[PDB]
Symmetry: D2
Subunit: 434 residues, 4 copies
């Protein structure tokens, strides 16, 4: 009460009733559950990304525009089906639908393109090598590598991407007992992980999949690397317009577990309700994110994270701590590769991480990190570097004010570096919105 | 031994943080403990055969639900008789006999304001046929619970009333409903139509948490393994839903169409049994017990005081079980509210209490049938010995195990006050 | 119930705090201590406190252990002091409200390498005169304790050896010394000369913490109320020092020159009594009990398992006392290690155990000398009732209070396995 | 490792105590300020120079004794001794001057009005107001300091039952508190003073306001060269309780060993500060501190969190009034708070806040404000290196503002030394 009394007088009682704030202020996890309220509405923008598998039900440019508006952040192309010609047309339709909103920063919404490989079916397959080369040639952002069983499998995928695919992210799919057992070595060499529950549920007893999902999500959260929860999340929506009680619960629990992304497979690739499936995941993720017990989560991420002498890492924890202290509406970060936004995201701030970048690939790939909202800055550089920096911060403060994220009177945390180029983030500023 | 500490997610249970607890979960760590979350199976055309109900009892069914929204009193009386016939077909082996509670799920009020006239007739049918529990549909306020209690009359004083929360009013008036109810059912089917579907998980977790705090049974119900009505295996979302209901703190999990009308009634029970054992081992008891202790108020009731001392003692020695003598089941319920990892073996002479304690997680009822000894202390020991012998036969106990024994100072209900540390011989 | 006034006394608002910082903020000078003083006072007996009349005044002021410093005087001098202590103690054997057992402790002169020749003669004197405790000077390694143990000859294996840590070697080899000792004395006088004076507080807090972890008695000694050797009131630093030794976790606090040679021996005892009562109420039991619990390893010893269950039960109902039957004092010691707020009333037939349990904080001994009953269960009930009657007589209990009773299942030492919740009638 | 780092890494307070090591040496600079009462035993300029070297940070003038002429000579001798080290600006130590009032005796007395006026005329930094028993007593002292004494700090002395009972209202209107144990131990039972001390220290820590522990801390050292075991324990426990300052009264004013008493408090405080269980302390201070929309308050918590993440050697903060350094100090960082200020009064007063090391900036301004700021930050680094706080390769947190003037702190920077 006294630790929120002056902020309650300032922001009002109605502010503290929304986005499960009474449940977030609880002293125990049990009290946190007791304080969850169906009448407490989510205010924050949805932070868990939705990956939609693109197929016959979601191929058209008009349908893809509907899915972008519904919340799709990553388009998945399953190379276990179709052909190179089929997937190239899908890629072109996604890019056409994405560029139909390029007229403004207030309307632009980047969509990453992910290639899900067919898999080994011994080691790296010959069609996997051909498909990975297709991905490099078509400019894919992410590879969902099927049946990764050891660290050498991810090294083989990296080698097959060649020197031109150095920027592509490799998300290793854990689909069998070997992948689960060798998880630490796979995560160490991967950019992220996908909990591929379809095959995992056949390879290990179905009643043990939840243990593997929660363990992998927890370790990925500890490592600060993206983790995707996949397969049968809203399965019944392939034929029905509404999901089952188990399905909405599953989506909410994947977000509560700590998943950075949630996925739709047949629900969007072949189902009768692809847009509705995206809308449903969007709705559940917004509710589940507000119900996250940040008080224990942030304390545990701080206690578990080792000490660091990397200024980006040090600035990120100071910025997230500052954002929680004032209930900052957003954390605006300037990033080239997306790394500074990723280091902010690993501490799970409630404040939106608005990442301003000049890299179109980084803007698409940061969708893998929960709570990161990418803004592609296209303006030519200013003669004075410090003015160019300030212009990019103001671009985020304007796009944020104008897209609801921010309001006059709000506090924002601004994360920048001391010199140009990747790797120099070391400054945190507290700014009041006017 | 080292192998003991690698099983039942003991490395994950020893973790200092919840995050480290999740990281330490092991798919190769096998569950050793008996399944403690009760399975309620709805009876219907797919599960009325005496021989099919015997298979469901062996699979793990603990409570048989009679849905009074379907069928006549004649139909429900036959369900009751077939359940009792299947249950009594195992009474020849008293150390391995499993009591099965009978629950009457009411039709509800409909466009009505309170207790319907059909509900009054069905509630009286339940009292006349000896039902143990009432799952009262669409409870919206405390006066709805009082009307159900009044309709049960003086002969139904022992029947438990589990209020079903199925709409926004029930969720908003939850505290007053829980106060006058014996427990709650999160009726997700109607709740998911009455409130936005994407909010049901918030209502489920809130109600389970409050019930855990109150020490009253909470049931998670509807569509848990829905696809198993026609398919032999459930979806990844369904197994996750069952596991998460157990992790949330549900005392009971339910099957509706999966057992009443589906093609896999036995397999649906076996699947819930398998998931619940895995999920119970993954419970982070270190935080859970500390939070239940911190939140529970001080008490001057000896049953309540003995229960917390016994659960604390069970954790200190990794007791295989807590054997409790109970008349009404209340001493077992007060042990269960602290969520011990040790099984609560409840020895009772009341067949109704033996059936009703299935509402409390981790309570394993043993119905004692022997005629009393003339010396009271000798009769209490004979029942404790019966608890140990059944525990050994069922795999709960072995020679060398430590067990906590909970008894009272005089006969009759309400006098539990002793906790003793016992070594199994 | 208990009333609002009950919850304002003995720093109960500060004890209910969720953080240690909030606990400090809630400390109230107007919140009066209700509980009996639980930290024992050791008074050094010398010229200023040698007379039978003066010793009677010191017993009334709160002296629990009489220390005889064998660094001064002779065997003849100390034998007269022992006889005067026993005479003063027995002058209250008619009044059950005034009778209090007083332990007799021999503080050795000290070492050279191994045990000194004078220490062998003095330890032999202690065995012949029936001393209860040995404060072994300058213990530096485990072999020093073994030498004292061997010197305690065939008739003295029951005497307790409290090793005095007085130098850098004793501090560095602390774990091996504590392992073989019955307890520790933080001998700050020599320690403050052997190591830098500004480091003594680190050694005191470390040794007290480790002793609390081990469940072994720890004494805080030297210059606690030094100025009271010549002045009737202590300094602000002295009262703070006594209070902080109690807050650190000391089982005993000591007076040296303050009682042996000073002008105000009775007043020094009265002052330590007054400060310890205040400091014990200010102990943050919520964190302390949770940390003692979390740090203590799992145990398969029924005495250790019963002790934690009993202390948990005592906290749950705000038990007025924990009555324990003990022949060696071990069951009372295992209760004391969990630092209950309830008084541990130890009923024993052993006069030596009754004197030695003063080393354990919160243990209030009662020597029982009635002839044994033919039925053991009746003999147990008679001693439990003796503990309740003495409790009512001394102010610990009233009709309507709840107590926790700790007994075992069969006679003789080592079988404590029972905890009962009893209502005072 | 050094500075009780194994004990600081412990998961419980019990294991923290068990891990305390007498062989683990303190590395960090002493954070708890020492207030020494100046009198006949510590009046000479030569004696005062030795007390400054021993660790004296605040000179207390007890207006219950002596005269205005006597105390004016003491003030002049303190200033003379302090300025005798001004030739080396990177290692010069500011010393605050505090006036302890006589008190009301049998409201604000007429002698107190004259003494408070003396303090304003002589430029004192702090007032230790005797026998404060309600918020209106603080207001009367504030009024008696007139318009020329707006910048003096008022530390209310709690010396009786009424002051203890009305503590919250007194702390609300005061700059800080002094636990005046001498009178408090006569006004309330002696065995209850420790409860009042620990309660007041805790509440002051919560409020982020300075708290002084005073009277009889090393009493025996008035006549003996070494203190008793109870005295060293008392000093260590006042620091462990959370006191920002510790005081010497008769030990320095009339005692045979004034320099040794200061040296002893310095030695004990360094040991006690290393034994502080920061893991629990920071988590409790952070949890208890309310949410804030003030950028100085928000930057302060972000900076302390960042300092703990990298084991920052120091937090260099630019301050005009000392407020930005005070807001850093309230979170009890292990990193030294090096406060670079151009105000000489702020530099002296900032000794009331634990862990704040004031550096008086006596360098000429740079034309560009961004450059003036960078030279004040380089000044902090250079003094830190010279005084042993910093080494090349160390990480520091730099707390600066967006525009000049008090109240605009909003920037935290992670900087690598050289
Ligand atoms: O992993 C699985 O096997 C199932 N799930 S899916 O990846 O979402 C999926 C992908 C696809 C199609 C359906 C479908 O459900 C499809 O009809 C199709 C038809 C023609 C070409 C490609 C596809 C194609 O890639
Ligand atoms: O040495 C320490 O550790 C502390 N000193 S003490 O043990 O409290 C102490 C004991 C004694 C006397 C004084 C005194 O201070 C005494 O005068 C005396 C006179 C004649 C015979 C015995 C004593 C005797 O035992
Ligand atoms: O997040 P990354 O990839 O490390 O890049 C962050 C970088 O962006 C900046 O804020 C601005 O740099 P640029 O001028 O290269 O865009 C740098 O100061 C910082 O090093
Ligand atoms: O849990 P309940 O219903 O309160 O029953 C516990 C009761 O059972 C007993 O242990 C045994 O009593 P009975 O001999 O009547 O079965 C009583 O001492 C105790 O009061
Ligand atoms: O603390 P100790 O020395 O183990 O004594 C406890 C013993 O006292 C008893 O409670 C009673 O024993 P006695 O009848 O022999 O005195 C035993 O059952 C128990 O083992
Ligand atoms: O501690 P204070 O009193 O708030 O002052 C800190 C001030 O120091 C600055 O960093 C620089 O101070 P100057 O006015 O001396 O340039 C300001 O931007 C900031 O407001
Ligand atoms: O391979 C997959 O994507 C799966 O099994 O879910
Ligand atoms: O009544 C039920 O079981 C429901 O609505 O879910
Ligand atoms: O003997 C003692 O007590 C000492 O040396 O402190
Ligand atoms: O003036 C003081 O400091 C006191 O009275 O304690
Ligand atoms: K695939
Ligand atoms: K029904
Ligand atoms: K001695
Ligand atoms: K004064
Ligand atoms: Mg697959
Ligand atoms: Mg329904
Ligand atoms: Mg000695
Ligand atoms: Mg005074």
């Amino acid at each position: 009460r006294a630790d929120v009394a002056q902020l309650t007088q300032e922001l009002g009682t109605a502010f503290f009733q929304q986005q499960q704030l009474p449940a977030a202020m609880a002293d125990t996890f049990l009290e946190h559950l007791c304080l969850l309220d169906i009448d407490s509405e989510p205010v924050a923008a949805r932070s868990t990304s939705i990956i939609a598998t693109i197929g016959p039900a979601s191929r058209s440019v008009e349908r893809l525009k509907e899915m972008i508006k519904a919340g799709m952040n990553i388009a998945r192309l399953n190379f276990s089906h179709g052909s190179h010609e089929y997937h190239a047309e899908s890629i072109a339709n996604v890019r056409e639908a994405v560029e139909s909103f390029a007229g403004s920063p207030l309307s632009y919404r980047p969509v990453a393109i992910a290639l899900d490989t067919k898999g080994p079916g011994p080691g790296l397959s010959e069609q996997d090598v051909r498909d990975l080369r297709f991905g490099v040639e078509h400019g894919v952002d992410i590879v969902f590598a099927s049946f990764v069983r050891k660290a050498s499998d991810v090294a083989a995928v990296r080698a097959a991407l060649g020197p031109e695919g150095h920027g592509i992210k490799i998300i290793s799919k854990i689909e069998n007992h070997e992948g689960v057992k060798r998880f630490d070595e796979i995560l160490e060499v991967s950019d992220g992980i996908m909990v591929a529950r379809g095959d995992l549920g056949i390879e290990i007893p179905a009643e043990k999949v939840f243990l593997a999902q929660k363990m992998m999500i927890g370790r990925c959260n500890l490592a600060g690397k993206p983790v995707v929860c996949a397969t049968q999340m809203l399965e019944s929506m392939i034929t029905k317009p509404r999901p089952t009680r188990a399905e909405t619960s599953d989506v909410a629990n994947a977000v509560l577990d700590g998943a950075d992304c949630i996925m739709l497979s047949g629900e969007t690739a072949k189902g009768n309700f692809p847009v509705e499936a995206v809308k449903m995941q969007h709705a559940i993720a917004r509710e589940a994110e507000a119900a996250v017990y940040h008080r224990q989560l942030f304390e545990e991420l701080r206690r578990a994270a080792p000490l660091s002498r990397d200024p980006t890492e040090v600035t990120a924890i100071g910025a997230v701590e500052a954002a929680f202290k004032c209930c900052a509406a957003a954390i605006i970060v300037l990033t080239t590769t997306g790394r500074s936004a990723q280091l902010l995201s690993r501490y799970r701030p409630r404040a939106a991480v608005i990442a301003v970048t000049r890299s179109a690939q980084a803007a698409r790939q940061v969708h893998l990190c929960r709570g990161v909202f990418p803004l592609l800055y296209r303006e030519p550089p200013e003669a004075i570097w410090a003015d160019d920096v300030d212009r990019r911060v103001q671009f985020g403060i304007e796009s944020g004010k104008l897209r609801g994220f921010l309001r006059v009177g709000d506090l924002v945390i601004v994360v920048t570096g001391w010199r140009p180029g990747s790797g120099y983030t070391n400054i945190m500023r507290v700014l009041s919105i006017s």
